């Protein structure tokens, strides 16, 4: 699905992609949800992940109107949710999953610089 970004970017400020984020992202929630999965185990694959399809395109529009980096989060809408692995390299099963609304705060093929941190995350549809 199509995601959104959030950041704690300050509305008034000129560092190039603080500028982008203020006009691209919502303010960040200081209390996200991270719920322990009981009992169950889920299959991950960093290499088949359509979160590294959308991030990569926002870095395009970042530069497009560009002319200190801050943390950006990526998050899901209703009907969907992010499962995160608490175990793991990038592929195969994972017993300790928890569900999250957003990713961690990310300092910025740079797709795969993102996969260096993405690997733990995956989307599912309710």
């Amino acid at each position, epitope marked *: 699905t199509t995601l959104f970004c959030a950041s704690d970017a300050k509305a008034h400020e000129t560092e190039c992609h603080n500028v982008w984020a203020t*006009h691209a992202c*919502v303010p960040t929630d200081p209390n996200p949800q991270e719920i322990h999965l009981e009992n169950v185990t889920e299959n991950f694959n960093m290499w088949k992940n359509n979160m590294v399809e959308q991030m990569q395109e926002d870095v395009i529009s970042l530069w497009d109107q560009c002319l200190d980096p801050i943390p950006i989060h990526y998050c899901t809408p209703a009907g969907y949710v992010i499962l995160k692995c608490n175990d793991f390299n990038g592929t195969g099963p994972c017993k300790n999953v928890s569900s999250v609304q957003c990713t961690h705060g990310i300092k910025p093929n740079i797709k795969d610089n993102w996969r260096s941190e993405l690997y733990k995350y995956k989307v599912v549809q309710i």
Partner: antibody
Amino acid sequence: QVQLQESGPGLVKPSQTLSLSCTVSGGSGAHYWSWIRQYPGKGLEWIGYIHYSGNTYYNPSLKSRITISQHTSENQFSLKLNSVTVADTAVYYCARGTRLRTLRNAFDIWGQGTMVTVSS
Amino acid sequence: VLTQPPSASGSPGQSVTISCTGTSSDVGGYNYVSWYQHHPGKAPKLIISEVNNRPSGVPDRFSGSKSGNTASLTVSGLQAEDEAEYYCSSYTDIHNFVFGGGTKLTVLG
């Protein structure tokens, strides 16, 4: 399913203080909850919005005449416009603004509009 | 604040285009131009987002664009049901928005 219904009092006296409620109905993210008015023709003016987080963002041309608020209770939200004149006669729409990529800074869902009239 | 033409006509089948002239801080300062279809007494449909993006369930025949500070919207292959009024909006400044006066797209019968 996500619809919006506006509700409100249709007449107000000048110098009084208009206030409208919009009732969401689908339906629950990171959207924005907005008030936009139509001066028929003219004519389309963004009033302001408030974020799910509670951040308000108003149109600078309303020098303090204006607040927007939430009732997570009854899945609704509302606007207060002050010191109205006949000028403020218009159709008032409520709407959902998104900051999803591919829809950033746009208004995906709208309200059916409702008329409001200022007169002594 | 944005400038549109008042009217725009075409027969069934024809193709039509609608200008929306802004300034460098409105259009041509951002790729956040949007377009709304509005039938009377009925709730506006967003049809183009972020300069040229059709949302789901919006037919391939509507299309967006912008050259300089003049964004523009096209309907290729008219049908009777496309007759409505069309507005454009653009993001501008730290959290603010502007619109056009609107354009009546008449499908000739």
